[PDB]
Amino acid sequence: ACDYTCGSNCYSSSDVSTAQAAGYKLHEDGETVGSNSYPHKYNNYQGFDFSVSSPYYEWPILSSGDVYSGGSPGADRVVFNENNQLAGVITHTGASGNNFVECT
């Protein structure tokens, strides 16, 4: 079973934890990877119900289970706050434009 389902991508809690950990570290270090500079600020304009406070940052989560290292980021993202607290898992999959939908 999947703790999170992004379109057809299935993620366990461990996948989310590993991704979050990597993204948070880069954040503390003042570093980014990839052409789109991850991790980067995330603005909740769609008003998802995050129970944790902003600011928020987005970091890619790979279907493969590998930690994002530059390269195609896919459509899935882990969202974390300034305090390394999980906000949610979202995806561009099935959303138009630059928008998102939450992973179920």
| Catalytic residue numbers, as ranges | 40, 58, 92
Q: Which is nearer to ligand 2GP, 15 or 58 (CB)?
A: 58
Backbone φ and ψ for 70, nearest 5 degrees, come out as: 110, 180
Q: Which is nearer to ligand 2GP, 1 or 5 (CB)?
A: 5
The reply on whether position 73 binds ligand 2GP by CB under 6 A is: yes
Interatomic CA distance for residues 34 and 91, integer angstroms: 18
The reply on whether position 15 binds Ca ion by CB under 5 A is: yes
Distances (CA, A) of 7 to 17, 60, 68, 72: 19, 15, 19, 17
Which amino acid, residue 62?
A: L
The reply on whether position 66 binds Ca ion by CB under 5 A is: no
What residues make contact with ligand 2GP under the rule CB under 6 A? Answer: 36, 58, 73, 75, 92, 98
